[PDB]
Design a protein around this ligand. Structure first.
Ligand code: C7B
Lengths: 279, 318, 279
């Protein structure tokens, strides 16, 4: 098609780039290229782009982005699209400053001399740890190897360049090392209404062990990851996002705080943001 | 001869059809008397044949009513007594029988003292102006409370048991002695639990795991007590101790006619709806704080040692 | 030496044989071969055998066996050893009937139509499941892949021959599948005083998730695995038995019952057995 290969090469373009940002870029250029001047026909092309892009990629982050920014642009007839492209550009700018804001709000929560415990590789956790070490903070790091795709080794390699002691641990050894970790920081792949996070398979184990040892469980995520889902148990999550599952759900009961570009939030506040945004 | 046979039968059918005798202490007394009459009125010379016929008749009893575990566990007590006497005389035939008879006699005379023992022990567990909660009806627990009331003032909250509201007569009996008693529906257990100090309840059977089989709804009361971290006390004599384990067994709950739960007069819906009336329910040992017995208080984590002290491990299957 | 190669070939002799049984066999033949007729000199050769055998193998089961049966034989001067060899033979017989007794006491605890959840391959769990399926019991099985040594695949292969549906799951996916498991059965590698078990690395995660979902957590182990240790946290366990750790500790707070040849036991009863045995 036209969006499949552009998304693929955007992944190739910037190996240091997220997937939701690539998705919003692809949908922006898709809407800017075809020149769809129709009140109702524009939405058809939009949802076609969204369904195609989360058919190629099974991320909840991509679908959440899609939904929220398609509503944002639709919330903006000839002048409609003329102002909608403006609002899309400024949305892209805000989403770009997202991760820097996230690092520079949450790097102050890591008391130095502590021990970070992290799940598989995530760009937001890496950014906040870079911000912390740039502020002259020394700490030890344990990383889960992320057995399905060995992203723990990748996280350890990326964090070793930051001049910090990183000790990638086994997937099932968090229960052993949880008493040696002062806190847990994990980058959510998607945030459900109640405050839970639909992250990699072992994040739920992380949170359960944290509640078993009262250890703080911190989560960092961009606000374009706020998805309007409410799973009651593991099976209640959409099966498309699970594909041996790949991504499981963690209740807000197990999360202490969320560090988003909208400031530090109680797991209770994300639902407030979502119902203010009205899906 | 045939007197023994017809009395054994009578007892079997009384256990099968309804509850006779009502008090399970009287049931223990009756079954012990019957076991004595069996061991006396049979032509047994070796202890093995006696143990075998005892096991057979005990199997018949257990098949009569599985939910009534007092009969079976006291049959196992008699078997352990026979084993102990045989070990004493072998580690001797007329002396064997008479020694078994005097062993049964001491078991019986200590059987009627468990009530008084628990009543005496009751005082050192109740303080002034305390709020007790109990569910259903239990002679042991009401004796406990009315013996503590002679020297202490306290409040008892009795949760009626639906459908069999035995808790109402328990509340009346407690009020007889001036024990300020509040009667409520079992639906209000968790609502009132926040203002309760202790939970004191009887039981129908204590399992080897430490769990106990008690009237339906008591598991919810135990969960509420655990949620509010209030101590849950079980005043159960040492003849309700059953060596069987929770899920190695069969026929745990006793299901009675659903007429008690939903009446016949409801009409056509009674052909479309499935009604269930479980009398007993399972309470795991994690929700019990202390067991009170005729010997003294014990944690649920010692009931297995009490088993080892009461029942031979090869007789747990009868 | 003489014990190293005999232990190795005993492992080669019977690939369907435990390590503690092999250790007791090797020590029995060691004591029966050298003919050590000394009141105090015999113990030197004994502890030499024990230290050698747990130097070659880092199992807590081997060391526990060693300790308990060296005390048993020492609890038995010319007639001393003559009766001690008798008592050792009968000890071997009891330890042989151990696993059959374990299977035939615990196979009745699996309500049919349930879902077993098991950690890495263990002979006792396999035996009890064989006893259950021989009693005409159908149930589903989830097995953890045991990432360090892929013993979950081995357990799945062994259990597939038993004509039961086995679904080996990921090491970090137990938190996802815990709601689909009616119970958890794991074969302990060693039993500490308080009732806890020092088992493979993910067993602690298993138990913690079980307490997070009130699911019954069952353990099956032979009484020669009763070790006289009391670890307070993960690091309190002996480091030699841990060798990235290999074996971690699970508190008795997280265990429901233990199925040993001495009958089903509350986690409280193992300490009773140990203090009756007096180490
Ligand atoms: O009157 C009642 C009846 O309670 C119920 C009756 C019915 C129901 Cl539905 C629920 C509760 N209970 C008493 C129990 C003592 C309490 N407290 C005191 O008397 C003082 O408590 C203290 C004082 C000092 C200390 Cl250190 C601790 C507690 C007042 C209420």
């Amino acid at each position: 098609k036209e969006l499949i290969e552009y998304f693929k090469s955007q992944m190739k373009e910037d190996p240091d780039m997220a997937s939701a940002v690539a998705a919003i870029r692809t949908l922006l250029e898709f809407l800017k290229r075809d020149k769809g001047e129709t009140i109702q026909g524009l939405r058809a092309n939009l949802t076609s782009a969204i369904e195609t892009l989360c058919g190629v990629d099974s991320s909840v982050a991509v679908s959440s982005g899609g939904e929220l920014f398609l509503r944002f642009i639709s919330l903006a007839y000839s002048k409609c699209k003329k102002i909608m492209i403006e609002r899309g550009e400024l949305f892209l700018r805000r989403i770009s400053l997202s991760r820097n804001k996230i690092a520079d709000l949450c790097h102050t929560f890591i008391k130095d001399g502590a021990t970070i415990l992290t799940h598989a590789y995530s760009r937001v956790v890496l950014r906040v740890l870079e911000a912390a070490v740039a502020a002259k903070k020394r700490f030890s790091v344990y990383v889960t190897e992320s057995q399905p795709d060995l992203s723990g080794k990748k996280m350890a390699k990326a964090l070793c360049h930051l001049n910090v002691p990183v000790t990638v641990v086994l997937d099932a050894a968090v229960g052993y090392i949880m008493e040696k970790a002062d806190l847990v920081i994990v980058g959510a792949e998607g945030v459900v209404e109640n405050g839970g996070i639909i992250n990699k398979i072992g994040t739920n184990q992380m949170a359960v062990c944290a509640k078993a040892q009262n250890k703080p469980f911190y989560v960092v995520a961009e606000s374009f990851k706020f998805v309007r889902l409410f799973p009651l148990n593991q099976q209640d999550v959409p099966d498309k996002f699970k594909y041996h599952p790949w991504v499981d759900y963690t209740a807000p009961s197990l999360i202490t705080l969320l560090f988003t570009d909208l400031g530090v939030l109680t797991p209770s506040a994300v639902s407030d943001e979502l119902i203010k945004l009205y899906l | 001869g045939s007197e023994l046979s017809e009395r054994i039968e009578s007892f079997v059918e009384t256990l099968k059809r309804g509850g006779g005798p009502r008090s399970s202490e009287e049931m223990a007394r009756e079954t012990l008397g019957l076991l004595r009459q069996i061991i006396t009125d049979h032509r047994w010379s070796n202890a093995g044949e006696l143990m075998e016929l005892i096991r057979r008749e005990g199997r018949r009893m257990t098949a009569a009513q599985p939910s009534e575990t007092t009969v079976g566990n006291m049959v196992r007590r008699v078997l352990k007594i026979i084993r102990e006497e045989y070990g004493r005389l072998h580690g001797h035939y007329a002396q064997l029988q008479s020694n078994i008879i005097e062993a049964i006699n001491e078991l019986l005379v200590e059987l009627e003292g468990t009530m008084e023992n628990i009543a005496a022990q009751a005082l050192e567990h109740i303080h002034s102006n305390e709020v007790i909660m109990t569910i259903g009806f239990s002679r042991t627990v009401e004796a406990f409370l009315k013996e503590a009331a002679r020297k202490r003032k306290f409040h008892v909250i009795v949760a009626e048991c639906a459908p069999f509201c035995q808790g109402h007569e328990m509340a009346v009996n407690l009020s007889k002695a001036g024990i300020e008693t509040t009667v409520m529906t079992d639906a209000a257990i968790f609502a009132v639990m926040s203002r309760v100090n202790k939970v004191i309840i009887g039981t129908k059977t204590i399992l080897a795991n430490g769990a106990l089989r008690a009237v339906t709804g008591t598991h919810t009361l135990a969960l509420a007590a655990k949620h509010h971290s209030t101590p849950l006390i079980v005043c159960a004599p040492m003849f309700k101790l059953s060596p069987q384990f929770p899920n190695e067994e069969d026929s745990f709950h006793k299901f009675v006619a659903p007429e008690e739960v939903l009446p016949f007069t409801e009409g056509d819906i009674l052909e479309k709806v499935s009604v269930h009336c479980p009398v007993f329910d399972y309470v795991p040992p994690e929700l019990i704080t202390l067991f009170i017995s005729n010997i003294g208080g014990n944690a649920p984590s010692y009931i297995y040692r009490l088993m080892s002290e009461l029942y031979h491990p090869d007789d747990h299957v009868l």
